[PDB]
């Protein structure tokens, strides 16, 4: 009831699919798309006169077959369109009907029925016959009520055999408000306060008269439904939870939607606040009229698009903040008007007219709207039963004319043929309808089976600061945590500066080496083997010993020689116990430290590459024969998909992302000893065309021999899948040279820090790795997700189960040589994102038992 909506201003969402029998559609309005404004006896409308005095169409009237083909491509269950009143009755009164206009709409309705497309027909989408404006004053004159009912009666008689869904008026708020308040819409009066509310009143009474007409004379034998399309914006308090601001949001909504919806869907009178403030000009419903206004709509038809947000004077905002939150608007409707059945009769946004077919932003607007609708259905139990995408094709957009585009199909208005070319949004919406929701195409069923008996089950930690072995208190708590898990392997990182404070071996800190040796030997007593990372750089902790840092760090090739000496010391002091080594963690995501220029990023990375290869060759010559372990490095290896999967430039950007992320280091070390060709060619071209000053330095034949073949296995840190689009960026930094922007996909599960849970990404990655680098042994050395929960971490449990299914699918089905999985990470720190299996107070989270269960079963047998 009135006021209940004010409450709206005060887990895991695993739904992709809309209810069975959800009704998918698309809409146009006659003025926007028909053209032929004076062909075949059509009379002029107030918009024809308004365009000709205040301000090449889609030509649907002559290209009806091209529109029907577009509908077939999309695959809608319904098509919403309006009848042009002056095309049927040139003078509005029901004297002789224009025969060619009747034939046009009749042919359209027949063609829809033959294609199994339900028509939804709007009697009035703003094109009042000019003759009625000039003779009577249009909606200002209440003789319009019988004149409009006469027109509707004819339409029920000629078309209602074939039409089961009727809309009387599209968005009456804008007819009154822009037609007579702002002057932005036909007939273009501005400031006429009395007319604004007199017009609103005759629109409401006309609607009600037509409803009773349909209800008594046509519904018994035609068995359809009739409503009216009410539009509104959404709004949020200008101060976050201020009660006076919330009170004003309610008033903003009441003033736009309540004005027409309280009489029709509510108690049958205008809202109380409006009656008081406007008791002046607001006409009065008699008590008999109130009982005849309410309940005159068989469902709630709701419009939510750019006409209720732009221009800025469209609504009284009461000082508050406009918002595109469709989910909240639907909840307000549910509260205010007592849980009605809802058709989304118009929803969409717009682009500039220069956007032709690649409308990425329309896809992401639709993703957001559709995700909000799905939430409203599933979480809020709002009875949305159908959805009208707007609009079918580009047309005339009112005062904006042809400077914006709203179609799912592109139309070149300067060509004679006006061919309807499907935009990206058309392909996307077509797939929405096919899957009745968001695509499952990349998801496969759970597989049954098991990992090898010698699969490495791991957990990861980052840098352990050094503190009998039981002396060190840090070690006790690590053992208590590992003893609660069934891992066979533990990954942790040393602190180079703790081991070698000066960088020189003559000044080794032997206490630090004793601490790390205790971690390993105590772990072995639990039956857990160590994988030891020598160097784990982060944005907060570069990890270099101070004298190397002040000698220019990784821009000084001497830093690589000092790393070789550090590595040898660790092999000597730990390598009888440690058989798995990572030289460097994610050197390819340490381009955030030497971010000055691209040349800096590429130069530092070159020295990191040399560091790794020097340590690897030292190990291979001097320590492998007596120790028989294995050495590699961990590559940051998120997956990438095109943001817009219907834009060829985004498929190229996805492959380019993998080139700059993974092949950058994997090509030299694994395969050729040199940088990937795609990356060097791309940077060169951007340099050749004057846009970047970056060069990827050429590698001597000697340096290529040093680097090639220096890994014993492939180690990958995989967390998520990024969605990427091509964009020519400015500057000569690393992120500029790769020409990539990122989008978040609202339709997928994600974490408090926006990490997307895309389980099939890891399978695609493992294929890409084997396709480009051969049948190497692969370890996933880090995999995980932050989760806000402190004990019942359901997102981590979901992540673990779904990603491990895809790993096992990579193993059983794709035959990838996957040898280990290390979960990230053992414990979280107090004010960092919560990746830990254990809380910062070493409390166990519920995902431990799930991971133990998978380890015990060796998968999902």
């Amino acid at each position, epitope marked *: 009831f009135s006021g209940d909506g004010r409450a709206i201003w005060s887990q895991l969402f695993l739904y992709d699919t809309f209810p069975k029998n959800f009704f998918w559609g698309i809409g146009t309005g006659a003025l926007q798309v028909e053209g032929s404004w004076k062909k075949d006896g059509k009379g002029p409308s107030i918009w024809d006169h308004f365009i000709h005095t205040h301000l090449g169409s889609s030509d649907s009237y002559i290209f009806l077959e091209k529109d029907l083909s577009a509908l077939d491509f999309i695959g809608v269950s319904f098509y919403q369109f309006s009848i042009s009143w002056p095309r049927l009755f040139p003078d509005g*009164i*029901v004297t002789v009907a224009n025969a060619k206009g009747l034939q046009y709409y009749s042919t359209l309705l027949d063609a829809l029925v033959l294609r199994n497309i339900e028509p939804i027909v709007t009697l009035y989408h703003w094109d009042l016959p000019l003759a009625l404006q000039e003779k009577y004053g249009g909606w200002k004159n209440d*003789t319009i009520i019988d004149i409009f009912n006469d027109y509707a*009666t004819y339409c029920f008689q000629m078309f209602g055999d074939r039409v089961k869904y009727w809309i009387t008026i599209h968005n009456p708020y804008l007819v009154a408000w822009h037609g007579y308040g702002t002057g932005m819409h036909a007939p273009g009066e501005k400031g006429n306060l009395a007319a604004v509310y007199t017009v609103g009143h005759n629109l409401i009474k006309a609607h009600s*008269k037509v409803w009773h007409n349909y209800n008594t004379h046509f519904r018994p034998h035609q068995k359809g439904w009739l409503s009216i399309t009410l539009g509104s914006h959404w709004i949020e308090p200008q101060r976050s939870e201020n009660t006076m601001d919330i009170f004003k949001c309610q008033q903003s909504m009441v003033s736009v939607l309540g004005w027409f919806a309280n009489p029709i869907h509510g108690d049958g009178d205008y809202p109380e606040g409006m009656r008081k403030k406007l008791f002046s000009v607001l006409p009065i419903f008699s008590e008999a009229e109130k009982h005849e206004m309410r309940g005159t709509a068989d469902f709630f038809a709701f419009s939510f698009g750019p006409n209720n947000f732009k221009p800025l004077n469209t609504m009284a905002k009461m000082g508050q903040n406009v918002s595109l939150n469709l989910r909240e608007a639907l909840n307000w409707i549910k509260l205010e008007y007592n849980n009605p059945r809802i058709l989304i009769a118009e929803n969409g946004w717009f682009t500039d007219s220069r956007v032709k077919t690649e409308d990425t932003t329309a896809i992401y607007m639709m993703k957001n709207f559709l995700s909000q609708v799905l939430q409203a259905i599933r979480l809020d139990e709002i009875r949305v039963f159908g959805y009208t995408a707007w609009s079918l094709l580009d047309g005339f957009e009112w005062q904006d004319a042809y400077t914006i585009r709203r179609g799912l199909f592109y139309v070149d208005f300067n060509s004679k043929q006006k061919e309807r070319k499907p935009k990206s949004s058309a392909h996307y919406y077509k797939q929405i309808i096919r899957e009745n929701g968001f695509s499952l195409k990349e998801s496969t069923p759970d597989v049954q089976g098991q990992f090898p008996c010698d699969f490495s089950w791991g957990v990861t930690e980052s840098v352990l600061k050094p503190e009998q072995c039981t002396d060190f208190v840090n070690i006790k708590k690590q053992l208590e945590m590992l003893a609660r898990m069934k891992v066979t392997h533990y990954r942790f990182a040393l602190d180079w500066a703790s081991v070698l404070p000066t960088g020189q071996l003559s000044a080794v800190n032997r206490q630090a080496l004793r601490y790390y040796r205790c971690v390993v030997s105590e772990g072995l007593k639990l039956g857990i083997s160590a994988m030891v990372t020598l160097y784990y750089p982060t944005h907060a902790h570069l990890g270099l010993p101070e004298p190397l840092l002040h000698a220019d760090g990784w821009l000084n090739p001497s830093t690589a020689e000092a790393f070789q000496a550090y590595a040898g010391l660790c092999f000597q002091e730990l390598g009888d116990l440690v058989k798995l080594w990572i030289t460097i963690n994610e050197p390819n995501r340490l381009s955030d430290i030497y971010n000055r220029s691209g040349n800096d990023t590429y130069g530092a990375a070159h020295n990191l590459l040399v560091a790794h290869a020097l340590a690897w060759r030292l190990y291979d010559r001097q320590f492998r024969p007596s120790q028989r372990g294995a050495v590699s490095l961990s590559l940051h290896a998120d997956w990438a998909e095109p943001a817009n999967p219907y834009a060829d430039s985004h498929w190229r950007a996805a492959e380019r992302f993998l080139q700059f992320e993974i092949a950058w280091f994997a090509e030299p070390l694994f395969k050729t000893g040199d940088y990937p060709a795609a990356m060097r060619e791309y940077i060169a071209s951007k340099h050749r065309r004057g846009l970047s000053s970056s060069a990827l330095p050429r590698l001597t034949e000697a340096e290529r021999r040093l680097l090639k073949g220096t890994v014993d296995f492939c180690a990958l840190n995989h967390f998520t899948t990024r969605f990427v689009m091509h964009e020519q960026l400015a500057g000569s930094r690393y992120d500029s040279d790769r020409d990539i922007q990122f989008l978040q996909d609202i339709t997928r599960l994600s974490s408090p820090t926006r990490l997307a849970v895309i389980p099939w990404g890891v399978r695609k990655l493992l294929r890409w790795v084997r396709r480009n680098y051969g049948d190497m042994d692969i370890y996933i050395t880090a995999s995980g997700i932050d989760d806000q929960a402190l004990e019942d971490d359901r997102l981590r449990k979901y992540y673990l189960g779904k990603y491990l299914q895809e790993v096992l699918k990579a193993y059983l089905i794709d035959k990838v040589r996957i040898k280990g999985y290390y979960a990230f990470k053992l414990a979280e720190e107090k004010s960092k994102p919560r990746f830990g299996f254990f809380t910062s107070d070493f409390k166990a989270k519920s995902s431990i038992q799930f991971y133990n269960k998978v380890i015990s079963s060796r998968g999902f047998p």
Partner: nanobody
Amino acid sequence: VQLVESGGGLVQAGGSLRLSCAASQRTFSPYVGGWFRQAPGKEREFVAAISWSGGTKLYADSVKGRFTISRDNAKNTVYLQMNTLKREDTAVYYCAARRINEVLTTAPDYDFWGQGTQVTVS
């Protein structure tokens, strides 16, 4: 539907009459109410018609300004108020009904007809 006229009769020139047509329908639906008139041996002549909700009314030019057509859907009745009657108005008056809500002026457009009632202006 059956249509039944009444109100005809004999009136002095310059006088006035009110004809009415009551419709009875076994499936009550909307209709256009029409009035035609016929002198003996002459063709049937359009007089006035009215749309279902009364927004459209048409009149023959010989009758504009003198005759007024109206309707009361609750009573299923269409009314013809005839003022300033002339001798040339003497005729049999026929009410007529057309289902499609489109106000037309020729006899073949009307599906249903009353028996007719005599109007005599002496």
